[PDB]
Specification:
Blueprint (H helix, E strand, L loop, with lengths): L2 H6 L10 E4 L8 E5 L4 E13 L4 E2 L13 E3 L2 H4 L13 E5 L9 E4 L4 H18 L5 E3 L1 E9 L2 H8 L3 H8 L3 H5 L4 E16 L15 H6 L8 E19 L6 H10 L7 H8 L1 E7 L10 E3 L2 H10 L2 E3 L6 E8 L9 E12 L4 E7 L4 E4 L2 E7 L5 E7 L7 E2 L2 E7 L3 E10 L9 E9 L5 E7 L4 E7 L1
Parallel strand pairs: 1-16, 17-25
Antiparallel strand pairs: 2-3, 3-16, 4-15, 5-11, 6-7, 6-10, 8-14, 9-10, 10-11, 11-12, 11-15, 12-13, 17-22, 18-21, 18-23, 19-20, 19-23, 23-24, 25-26
Length: 465
């Protein structure tokens, strides 16, 4: 069999062949009530399905040797796992092209036997060709691309940020369990820094890559199949990537809010509300490419340190070598761009915080009073529905004389608070003057009910803390 015939005799789905089948969901409860120390956490849970189709694949800085312009790879199940099967055979010369500024021009060069070694040489030689014409200026700005996402699933954040889950896991330390138990609220940003790209001139036919001596039965033996179709690395982004982790123990609906407020440094990042969230928040910044040394990290409570990390890696130097961040590939058959089809189901967890309170009753009046304190306690059934539990203060409908002071403590799941004080000038409770009559009292920390005055001129005030 021929090479150009062989490669065409391949019946594979150009779409489904490079596809990640991100895990199918674990059974969730739509709503969950959870008491966790002076706090009642209400978590709502929704199943979400995301379908991404990136044409850009990231490279694990460990196996960077297998990815370069003109490289030959396989569209096998190992490709989606960012560790591809290489294809080293005898090659016909292939042309590469740098996209560095102010180059019309000589930006293009010919490589005789495309191998990582001489291809790196050709990229280096092309860079020499730029930094000789621009002998004076060595520092250029990086072409920064910014991504930002809330973390729910290991599978989701990987599908969200087109970054290998393990990379993200190891380099940042995403506690995916705390995240899955709504014990931690995690946001990860990704400042993708591109120095330049090296493009490798596409062939007219599959044969234009392979030296004539090479046959389809050698490639067939080398792993080429309908299951592992051949690929060519058409483009490679060279540079670094700063990843930033924003961690909090809070369940306050305004985390994403305080986090965005903080990254953008918008005036609101100063208000009291966002302040308690920053008190339980750690910021981690890691850089991955070439320049910063392996296992570098910033772990801070002051976002200004992180801010420094980004402004520092926003400029690259033309004399220092660049390392491959991501890459485009093409199927040898249609010369069409190979894309990864990312299916992923995940649970989108939303949460709210509630902190306990207490009604403080204070009778001081020149009369007898009677109280009618009552509220509900919210619980959630297995189907997610709200279940009300009617509670009443034990001292309800019993005579109180000046001076009487008490506390009616309320559990953070308390709703429907009613405080009522009636005045004993009358036959029985049913027909007594209200001194205070309050409905749907908002659960504070302190609900201060004070009844004072005279049996004819009584006073009442409902104050909060």
């Amino acid at each position: 069999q021929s090479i150009d015939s062989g490669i065409s005799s391949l019946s594979y789905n150009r779409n489904e062949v490079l596809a990640s089948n991100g895990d199918k969901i674990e059974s969730f409860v739509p709503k969950e009530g959870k008491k966790a120390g002076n706090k009642f956490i209400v978590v709502e849970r929704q199943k979400r399905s995301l379908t991404t189709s990136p044409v850009d694949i990231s490279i694990i800085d460990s196996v960077n040797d297998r990815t370069y312009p003109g490289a030959l790879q396989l569209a096998d199940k190992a490709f989606v796992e960012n560790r591809p099967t290489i294809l080293m055979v005898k090659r016909k010369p292939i042309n590469i092209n740098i996209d560095l500024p102010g180059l019309k021009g000589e930006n293009s060069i010919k490589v005789d036997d495309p191998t990582y070694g001489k291809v790196s040489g050709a990229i280096d030689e092309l860079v020499s060709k730029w930094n000789e014409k621009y002998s004076s200026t060595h520092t250029l700005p990086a072409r920064t691309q910014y991504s930002e996402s809330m973390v729910y699933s290991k599978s989701q954040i990987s599908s969200a940020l087109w970054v290998n889950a393990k990379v993200l896991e190891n380099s940042l330390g995403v506690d995916f369990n705390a995240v899955a138990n709504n014990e931690k609220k995690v946001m990860i940003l990704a400042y993708k820094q591109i120095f330049y790209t090296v493009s490798a001139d596409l062939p007219k036919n599959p044969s234009d890559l392979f030296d004539d001596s090479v046959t389809f039965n050698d490639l067939k033996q080398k792993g080429v199949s309908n299951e592992a179709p051949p690929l060519m690395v058409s483009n490679v982004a060279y540079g670094r990537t700063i990843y930033v982790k924003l961690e909090t123990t809070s369940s306050s609906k305004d985390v994403q809010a305080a986090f965005k407020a903080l990254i953008k440094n918008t005036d609101i990042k100063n208000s009291q509300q966002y302040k308690d969230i920053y008190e339980n928040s750690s910021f981690t910044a890691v850089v991955l490419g070439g320049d910063a040394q392996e296992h570098n990290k910033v772990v801070t409570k002051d976002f200004d340190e992180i801010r420094k990390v980004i402004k520092d890696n926003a400029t690259f130097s033309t004399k220092n070598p660049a390392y491959p961040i991501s890459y485009t590939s093409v199927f040898l058959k249609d010369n069409s761009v190979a894309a990864v089809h990312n299916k992923t189901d995940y649970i989108e967890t939303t949460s709210t915080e509630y902190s306990k309170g207490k009604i403080n009753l204070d009778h001081s009046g020149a009369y007898v009073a009677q109280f009618e304190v009552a509220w509900d306690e919210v619980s959630y059934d297995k189907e997610g529905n709200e279940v009300l539990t009617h509670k009443t203060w034990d001292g309800n409908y019993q005579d109180k004389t000046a001076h009487y002071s008490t506390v009616i403590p309320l559990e953070a799941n308390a709703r429907n608070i009613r405080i009522k004080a009636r005045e004993a000038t009358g036959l029985a409770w049913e027909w007594w003057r209200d001194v205070i009559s309050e409905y749907d009292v908002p659960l504070t920390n302190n609900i201060n009910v004070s009844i004072w005055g005279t049996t004819l001129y009584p006073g009442s005030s409902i104050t909060y803390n």
